[PDB]
Amino acid sequence: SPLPWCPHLVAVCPIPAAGLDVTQPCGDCGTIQENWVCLSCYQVYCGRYINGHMLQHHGNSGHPLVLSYIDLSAWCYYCQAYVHHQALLDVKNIAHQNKFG
Ligand SMILES: O=C(O)CCc1nc2cc3nc(CCC(=O)O)sc3cc2s1
Ligand SMILES: [Zn+2]
Ligand SMILES: [Zn+2]
Ligand SMILES: [Zn+2]
Incomplete structure (x- = not known):
């Protein structure tokens, strides 16, 4: 049962030019x-x-x-x-398409 809203949704941005790659590895390790x-x-x-x-990224950014x-x-x-809200639907949908085909 995620929260239906949080005060940080305002920081959700549009996705990169190239879209999302759910098989992208960790940028550090x-x-x-x-x-x-x-x-x-x-x-x-x-x-x-x-x-x-x-x-760590959360702490440093x-x-x-x-x-x-x-x-x-x-x-x-x-x-x-966990949070689910309209502001997250597009990014979830794009990720789901890339993941499951
Ligand atoms: O950095 C990551 O691993 C991805 C983001 C997440 N961090 C979590 C932390 C977390 N602390 C919980 C409360 C009880 C406890 O386990 O101590 S439930 C729970 C779920 C997530 S999802
Ligand atoms: Zn929040
Ligand atoms: Zn890592
Ligand atoms: Zn970031």
Whole structure:
């Protein structure tokens, strides 16, 4: 049951020119596992169970919201919750198309 809104949705940006690549590896360690994409700047970094690079990215940029390339959920690091909202539908849909074909 994600939150239906959070105060950080305002920081969600339009996706890169080239679209999304759900097989893009972590920009720091290159892992192919458990990556997330940043919904502000669209850099890709790994989850807390691999090397924690997305949490590091959150700390060093302040960017709030990230989308999972495993299950297309969106986490806000400030609110410490999952969020779903209209503002996230396009990025979720584009990711889902790229993932499942
Ligand atoms: O496990 C606990 O201590 C209880 C509360 C939780 N912390 C989480 C952190 C978390 N970070 C996410 C973004 C991706 C990443 O950096 O791994 S999704 C996600 C889900 C949970 S549930
Ligand atoms: Zn990494
Ligand atoms: Zn970012
Ligand atoms: Zn938030």
